[PDB]
Enzyme design. Sequence first.
Site, PDB file in Angstrom:
ATOM      1  CD  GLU A 154      -2.066   1.225   3.076  1.00  0.00           C
ATOM      2  OE1 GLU A 154      -2.174   0.103   3.611  1.00  0.00           O
ATOM      3  OE2 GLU A 154      -2.465   2.276   3.620  1.00  0.00           O
ATOM      4  CD  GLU A 156       2.844   7.954   8.654  1.00  0.00           C
ATOM      5  OE1 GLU A 156       1.662   7.859   8.262  1.00  0.00           O
ATOM      6  OE2 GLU A 156       3.306   8.994   9.169  1.00  0.00           O
TER       7      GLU A 156
END
Lengths: 418, 302, 51, 78, 102, 53, 445, 160, 55, 32
Positions: free
Chosen positions: G59, G136
């Site tokens: 992704e 992240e």
Amino acid sequence: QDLEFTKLPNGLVIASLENYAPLSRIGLFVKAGSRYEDSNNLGTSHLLRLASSLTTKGASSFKITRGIEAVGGKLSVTATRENMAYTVEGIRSDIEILMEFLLNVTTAPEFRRWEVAALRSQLKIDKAVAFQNSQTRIIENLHDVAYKNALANPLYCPDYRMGKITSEELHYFVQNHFTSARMALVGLGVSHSVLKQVAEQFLNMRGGLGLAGAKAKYRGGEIREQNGDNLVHAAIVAESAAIGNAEANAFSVLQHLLGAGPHIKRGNNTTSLLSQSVAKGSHQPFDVSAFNASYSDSGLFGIYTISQAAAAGEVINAAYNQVKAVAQGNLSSADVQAAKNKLKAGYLMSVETSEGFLSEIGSQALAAGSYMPPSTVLQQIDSVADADVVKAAKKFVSGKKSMAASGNLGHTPFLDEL
Amino acid sequence: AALRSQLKIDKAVAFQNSQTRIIENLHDVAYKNALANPLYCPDYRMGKITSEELHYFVQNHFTSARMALVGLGVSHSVLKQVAEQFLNMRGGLGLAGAKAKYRGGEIREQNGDNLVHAAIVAESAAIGNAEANAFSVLQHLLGAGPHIKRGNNTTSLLSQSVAKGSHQPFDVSAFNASYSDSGLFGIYTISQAAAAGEVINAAYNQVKAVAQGNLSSADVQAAKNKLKAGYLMSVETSEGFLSEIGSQALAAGSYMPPSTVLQQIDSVADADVVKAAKKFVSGKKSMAASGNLGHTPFLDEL
Amino acid sequence: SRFLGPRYRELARNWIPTAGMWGTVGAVGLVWATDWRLILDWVPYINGKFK
Amino acid sequence: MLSVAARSGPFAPVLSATSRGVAGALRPLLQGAVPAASEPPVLDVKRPFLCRESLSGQAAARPLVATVGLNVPASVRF
Amino acid sequence: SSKWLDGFRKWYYNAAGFNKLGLMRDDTLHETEDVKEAIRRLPEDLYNDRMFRIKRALDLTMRHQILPKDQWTKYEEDKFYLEPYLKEVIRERKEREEWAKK
Amino acid sequence: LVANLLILTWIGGQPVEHPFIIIGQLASISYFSIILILMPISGIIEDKMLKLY
Amino acid sequence: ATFAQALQSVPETQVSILDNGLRVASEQSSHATCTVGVWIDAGSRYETEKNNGAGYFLEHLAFKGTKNRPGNALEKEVESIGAHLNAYSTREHTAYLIKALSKDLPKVVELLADIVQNSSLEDSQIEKERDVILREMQENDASMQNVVFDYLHATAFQGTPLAQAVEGPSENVRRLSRTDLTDYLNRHYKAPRMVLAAAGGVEHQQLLDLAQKHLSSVSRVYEEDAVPGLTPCRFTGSEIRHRDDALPLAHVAIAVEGPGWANPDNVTLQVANAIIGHYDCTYGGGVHLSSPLASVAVANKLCQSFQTFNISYSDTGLLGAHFVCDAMSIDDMVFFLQGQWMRLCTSATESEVTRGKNILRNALVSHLDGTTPVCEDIGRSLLTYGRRIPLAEWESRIQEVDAQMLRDICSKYFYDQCPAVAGYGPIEQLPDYNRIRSGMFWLRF
Amino acid sequence: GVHLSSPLASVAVANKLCQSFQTFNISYSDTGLLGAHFVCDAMSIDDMVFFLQGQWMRLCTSATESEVTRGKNILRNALVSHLDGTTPVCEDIGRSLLTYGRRIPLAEWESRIQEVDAQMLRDICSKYFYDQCPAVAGYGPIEQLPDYNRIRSGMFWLRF
Amino acid sequence: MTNMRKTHPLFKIINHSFIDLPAPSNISSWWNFGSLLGVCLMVQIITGLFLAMHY
Amino acid sequence: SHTDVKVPDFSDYRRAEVLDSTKSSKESSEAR
């Protein structure tokens, strides 16, 4: 079907589109934003926005809340510095009592002392929750340092005014600004006939022009909030065109040219000129964008930079130098066309949802009184030229600046060394 | 860690009165650095000052070359022995500073006070200048406080000018604050919310008339007498005398007698006062205002 | 009239089986604790001990 | 395109304040909660200045001096 | 007629005895939940007046005395200050009970 | 009611004869009637006389 | 025109199947814009503890460059045509969606196909994105409710592929390389596990033609003749506590085993979750809120927020509530939430049943208003149910739900069941599992 | 902080009772007011009254020579640091010639302070404080301010 | 130094129940009968204890 | 990171019908 407008001769605008949607959706738009307060009644707009579920002359607070939640609808207040929108959503079967509740709330509030005394603490909680994001703090500080009287009033009530807002002040604000010449009734999924009838038999008591607010005056200057965060936020803006202008459209095209948000999740923003100019000499993470806020009196255009504490000067100088290059004429027609396509796509994606369409029709009915179809807006955006964009960038460069900064401001530059 | 709560309480007690907050804000908008640092700890820095930060500050600024050990009622020999016993283990000149660059500008804090406090200042001379002495004489000419309890401030030019066109409680004075490298001279007004613009404009017009030259030598002599008397009663108290001799030892490194101080105060001329007033008029302004600011004018409106 | 209404009526209707089962529990416990002849001389097994 | 959402893309919920007086059927992301903010200390109120004679002398004319002590009250000198 | 009823109400008002302590009818109303809601909905001056009258009545009952006949409150001057607040609280409670029943 | 309690104590004093039969019966009936029926009715008409509803 | 007539007037979605098995569906509306997305049956339920973050890396790396468009040319083309490109990955699904205008549909479809089937994974991008996911994940554990949802999933599906999060552990993030990513791509990106869903101003014939042009023969071959089977995941009642008293607020999530996507009881459980509801301090409803849990919360100042959730996966799910509250009210919120659950189990009434039905109708239509959520619903519906259930059928099920059905289904899924508890923060007053279960039954039914 | 030599100040810091307290001795012609004034919150008035009265009776009953020497040094510093300055000197001259009829010199004050010891401090404190009806003035949230009978019961001790 | 009366647990229970109890200032002699009943109970306990000592 | 938190093995404490993580629960919860 198609959207249709009428103007009731007390000054009211009624908008209807019977699209046979499963959920009828009716908003009422008032020109009673925060700009219509002065120094003696600050935060009255905030308490009025949070006071949508109080006792009314025709329905109690308990009746309003329990009836709306029993029919499954919702009631929300969306307020900006110019406007307030009271929106009800629900099934078409219950839209009659939804309109009854909505018009009772908007036209006949009781405003009892104990209820607003209970609402003051909820107001403080709402202000703290909204300032959990530093962007809101930076933007309101920017408005405060940029404007003098009208638009300098914040969207949230000041801490000193917490506890001293009175029911008399709320009643005065409602009686002076919730007036038929400054309201528009917009409905989606509802009939124009029943909309006209409910407007007629809940809007037969106030028909003046309302209290005329003062014109906004620019002051400029810089204000800085030292709070020691690792990320420095800095908004540097200048006075721009008011909304509803070809030069305002040029400013919007310039904003989307310089970068007005991300299009790809976790992207690099490779077509944003500000992002490219900062990334040419910065290795730490950053986020630079173009900020554009237009109101019927005046506008603010500038750059918003979130950066590191050490690299704040480099990020701000790179973004400002990119805008100076654009003002000098360092741009291409392909980039202008890409900016136009981005602006058209953003406008249409705002329109395509029911909330955005309802807000668009309400704001257009307030400001102009006649519906402007999306094709004509697209035609105007196409009619924006590159020379107008150069003129807008030159206006931002030449005009005096307003800076709102926060963070670890040891290396953040001031206005006079920009 | 137990002391930072006392730090919060001390800042609250200090910010009980509005003048502290006004002049902290005034320095904050008057300087970019090295004098805009607040005299009290910011609320974000509360809870985050550490022992190593305190040790770093002490080891960089508490050195022997930046110290003066003064003493009243003690022997010079005993003071010499305690100095050579405690103060030989510090380094030298230490950290320099950041020269206190000026910025100008303004901030306005609307807090719903019954009275509006507004200070408008501009850059002036530093400690050790005949220009600074002229600025002090100008401050005492314009009014640096009341000499009479419940008085009318008859010789105070700004008090007379404001009372000429007002009938409300007011208090206007001249603010002077000089430092090692820069100074701030201006006007401080405490007025009503409605009459704040008139009070500030009357004060600024009085200072502009002084800059144009509307002043008499008798009033200059009275201002010099006020300044000499104020300095002498400052030196009068033994605590004030100790503070004065210690400040002189830190700044100049040698003791200047009060006779010499009064001699240079008398050596201040009136043309120097006119030049100082013209400097304040033509200089860039720093304004700190607070109260109910619905009628307080902005810096471009002055 | 606080307890007289349709919602209270149907809440009571939901609580009839539980209250009746609790009453049966109490009745059976009362017979078992008191060794009541008038009930316990009809069940098959417990008839044996009374002779 | 005469709307704050249609003009400012990512700055729509910053330029705009939305409060739902009646909760809707769908909750939004980032509900938000205050982290139990503390209170300023309960402390004495200063006298007001309702007359010009008591108001006189309150205007600052000298720079700040902050005085603290082991057993003397902390003083602020203007 | 109404005149005889008013006179007999005056006689009962003298016979009740709370006028001798400076009290009022709304002062001597027993504090239930609705009554407490009414007192909390009262304005500041009426709240202070009611609490001072209650305090003075308690002091007089402690001393086993009454006010002088000049300082007795009169039946014509007995203000019905808690009546609208109490009526509104009862109306809201009846609305809540009706909604809970339906 | 207090007087009737005194009557009941007295009637418990003397044995169950004439006229203590009818005196005790009327005392008990009046006692229950006062403590159940008469006092709330008196409170209701008292509130009506003070104009509470 | 009433609710049923308007729901019938909502247009139907056309579904077609290509030669390779890819499912192409569209809903046509009067909007000038459209959104087109590829939905892939891939995620943490298919990752096998050695490639635990592989879908998350793909992704990340899908938009960083393809074989046909190297580098940032894809981002340049998307931002030139003005489209918004988004992607997300749950534990079962992966979605790559584009919102654009109607006239840019061939370019959008070609870009989506190039993203899906021709991703270029250069090792410099692998390392740079490895740093990106590390940052992240640090920001993700900075957020607090995501931590609690991951903890609830781990403690509720431990020993099964649903325990692991979408991101995977940091050691897996550091050690997995390009070969593992390409193996995941060549295993889980087959044609029969992809839906090309379009919503808005899109013609189904044009979408089908463009799918035949670009998304034809995407993989179609597993290359080993070993189709991975999706085994059931065992739900175990359990409790995880991350006590850290320095945090200002406490996040507690309590759930039970859900029915799954294919069960018809999801409508009834959503009605019950609408009855209980959601609340936060922003709401101005006050004490007059219809839901008893939020009314008690605002009356007693108990919590900062709570919500009811019903997360569903293939024949499993998590049905429950999650609340943010101060350290001195966790026991009270657990008691009141369990009392409301068992009140729905035992004596749920017709008034709150029809209130929850109206709330569910409004929630479904409000969610399905908008091209992007319509396309999301189309892709998710074809991946889970195998068909797009119309709003008329949803309303028919909602009308089938009544009070006796609600209390029966709530007694089946809530009463006397072992829950999964995930606490984070100052959760000392949060009761133990024995007290939580004892609240998860009543002694009076 | 908590390490203050004054025990009332130490317990005030330790229990966070009062915002501040001070002691006063105001004198007029053959009369005066001698006592203590404190500002506190609404939930510490009874504790502050109890601790202040306990310190007063500790002075009344069990006075300590070291603390008396501490107080004598404090008082000497108080008078001389007050009399540093021309306008306090003039103020003291005016008060002295209006009250005593003469200016009491610093040597005389020091002689009286040297005459002060623990025993006569105990006697004078017992004469003026112990079992005396006080004057109490309360302003503000003084609901926790104890009754006058409780203040009297603090004014006498049952252990002495 | 601490306040023993409101610090010691049994002492603070006694203080909060009987010593520092906020009582109405105007209760007449009819409010003495609860304490009279308690004192009568204690007297009965003692006298009956001696009666059962010799009974 | 919080995803590194793995619930440890409980197979030496689990019941006989709960040991298999592939086989679902709720056909044995009634029995337990």
